[PDB]
Amino acid sequence: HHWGYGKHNGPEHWHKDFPIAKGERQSPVDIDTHTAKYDPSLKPLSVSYDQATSLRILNNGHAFNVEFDDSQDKAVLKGGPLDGTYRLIQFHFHWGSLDGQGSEHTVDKKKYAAELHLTHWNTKYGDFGKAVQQPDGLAVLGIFLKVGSAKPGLQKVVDVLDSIKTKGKSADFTNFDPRGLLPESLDYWTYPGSLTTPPLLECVTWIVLKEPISVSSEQVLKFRKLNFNGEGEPEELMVDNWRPAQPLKNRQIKASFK
């Protein structure tokens, strides 16, 4: 893999190594709020993070991942559009170089400053690597970030970023509670899609919350001090690590709310 978000290896190039990039259920997408139909058959989302066990935070060269112990049913997502039980494995964000861009999904073409992805795998497939090979293998909970008041529950994340500045660096990151990153409402849109980074597998049920969380300018500024590069290499700030909206094609976005 040599893909990224730079001037020569960005999303518009990914199809050359990952031809599924031009596939029929790629993500992210623009959510046209007027066209998304309310589906009264959709259940409330069940987010059960009470026993979530974070372990580590890693700069992987494209984002930072907060990783969870997913060796048993601790932090799970169920309900909503989902059949069965999906286990939290990691979360990460996508963000911009300025507050006017950064999200992957858009809402009536609005870009948010960032987007949080909580990634979960369907336990019926036994492990993450097998789940990503299935059309219903993953459920990603997407949450928009806007800049305003600080998010207190995010500060522990931002304060560790200086210790994982460059690609390949990790730090212990235990006892982090991802419930502190959720908005008040769990109203959502949902559609079938894909991973938004290579290999872009078409294995994701997307659940995108309508209500953004607010973070402070200072918090997002610290995201933007991370580096895509490794230690000692020329500094490339980790910014604009988002894939743009992809064609909706033959898909319906459903709303959980009127």
Ligand SMILES: NS(=O)(=O)c1nc2ccccc2s1
């Ligand atoms: N950015 S994301 O769609 O949340 C996501 N991307 C990837 C890439 C590989 C494996 C899992 C995921 S989950």
Ligand SMILES: [Zn+2]
């Ligand atoms: Zn993501």
